[PDB]
Structure formats: C-alpha cells, structure tokens
Amino acid sequence: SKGEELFTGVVPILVELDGDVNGHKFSVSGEGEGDATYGKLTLKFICTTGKLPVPWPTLVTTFASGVQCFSRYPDHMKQHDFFKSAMPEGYVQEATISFKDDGNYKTRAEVKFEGDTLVNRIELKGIDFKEDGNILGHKLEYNYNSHNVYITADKQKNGIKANFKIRHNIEDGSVQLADHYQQNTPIGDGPVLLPDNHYLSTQSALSKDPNEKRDHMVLLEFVTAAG
C-alpha cells in the first residue's frame, strides 16, 4: 500500500485529550516516538489542570488504541494491515469501556498526519460511577498485564471492529474486570485493506520520571500481529 512507505524509519507522536467524569473536568498532553520495523513505542503524559480524578491505569486502553499503526506485521500477513493503508488522510475511532458492577467511559478520536508527525485528538465522557468503588475511591495498583486484541472486518462501513477483556489488580489481592469494544471508519475516499480474522499480541510497562513533580505517567510497549 501507499501508506506503508511513511513508516520505514522513526516517526514523532503528539496527543491531546479533554475529559469529564461524574462532574469533574480535566485535560492531558502527551509526546513521544515510534518504530514500526521493531514494533516499539515510548511516551510521556502530563495532567495540565492539576491532579487526575481517576487512576492512571484506567486510561491505558484509550491512549494505546490511537497508536495501533505502529504494530509489526510479518511479511506473510502484510495484506491484513488496515491501519497503515488509511494514511495520510486517516480515520475516526469510537469506543465504550464497561466496568463490572460500576460505570462506563464513552470516547471519540481523530487519527491522522500533520506534516511529518502522527497526531491524536480525543474527547471522553464518564457516567454512573459509585463514590466508594474501586475507581473513584482509588483502590488500584500501578501496573498492567499482557493481553491479546481480536480484530474483524466491517464491510457495510468499509472499516474494522475490535474487542478484548481486561483484569485490573486491586490492593487487597483480588481483581476488577472490564471490557473494551471499538469501531473504525475512514476519512478519505481512497482504497483501504479489509482483513480476515486475526489478533495483536501486546506487553506493557508503567514507570515514573525521578525529576518530575507534576502528576504524570511514562509508558513502554511492544506489539506484534499473529494469525
């Protein structure tokens, strides 16, 4: 595809988010770099309005979804890469994150190229949360486990669909369950690749910057496509 040639080296990344959870408004800014030949990514996020009203690990699926274009697809599987084929014009992404016995997050994002940089613009709305629960009560640990993302084609809208289950570790030893459901639609009127059923194997690591006093998060990720 024509969009594939834009990912042969190291490319800079820029992210911006605006949110509202149970009446509390906030804003986040991010910056980093990606190398698709090795399926490697490095990013740093900062809260520009003060302190974050929700735990940092609950926002990982929203941030990681916007950079799925940096996945390493093996030679025998290159005909199944929707993400790179839609570039430079891009796509619109809509999703729902449901927490068991608690509330939900509804999101919308624009992913495209501006110059020689890959850009992400996101909006989030959170409703029906419990004040004494695991989310608003800040009872989750600062970590994230390995998982698989399942993909399928959506012919009627010339795009794709994605789904997986999440397991968040709690302070007492137990876990908090969640589900992520997503849908992608192209912006331009050019050709795209429609895939057969497959998955993406992922591993992540969360850390802190020792010289930083503002509320933040550092993320490192490795992603590979498999049949």
Residue 60 CA to residue 75 CA, distance in Å, equals: 29
Residue 194 CA, chain-centre distance (Å), reads 21
Burial letters 85-115, b for 16+ CB under 10 A, else e: bbbeebbebebebebeebbebebebebbeee
Nearest to 13 by CA among 121, 122, 90, 119: 119
For residue 136 the two structure tokens come to 């608003």
Nearest to 95 by CA among 196, 202, 195, 179: 179
Please name the residues in contact with 18: beta carbons below 8 A apart, sequence gap of 6 or more: 27, 122, 123, 124
For residue 64 the two structure tokens come to 């990681």
Class of the domain covering 1-227:
mainly beta
Please name the residues in contact with 84: beta carbons below 8 A apart, sequence gap of 6 or more: 1, 3, 4, 6, 7, 36, 69
Residue 24 CA to residue 45 CA, distance in Å, equals: 19
For residue 101 the two structure tokens come to 């016995």
3-class SS string, the chain:
CCHHHHHCCCEEEEEEEEEEECCEEEEEEEEEEEECCCCEEEEEEEECCCCCCCCHHHHHHHHHHCCHHHCECCHHHHHHCHHHHCCCCCEEEEEEEEECCCCEEEEEEEEEEECCEEEEEEEEEEECCCCCCCCCCCCECCCCCCEEEEEEEEHHHCEEEEEEEEEEEECCCCEEEEEEEEEEEECCCCCCCCCCCEEEEEEEEEECCCCCCCCEEEEEEEEEEEC
Are 159 and 82 spatial neighbours (Cβ–Cβ below 8 Å)? Answer: yes
For residue 202 the two structure tokens come to 């992922």
For residue 216 the two structure tokens come to 């933040």
Nearest to 185 by CA among 162, 205, 158, 155: 158
Residue 158 CA to residue 7 CA, distance in Å, equals: 23
Any idea where the domains of the chain sit in the sequence? 1-227
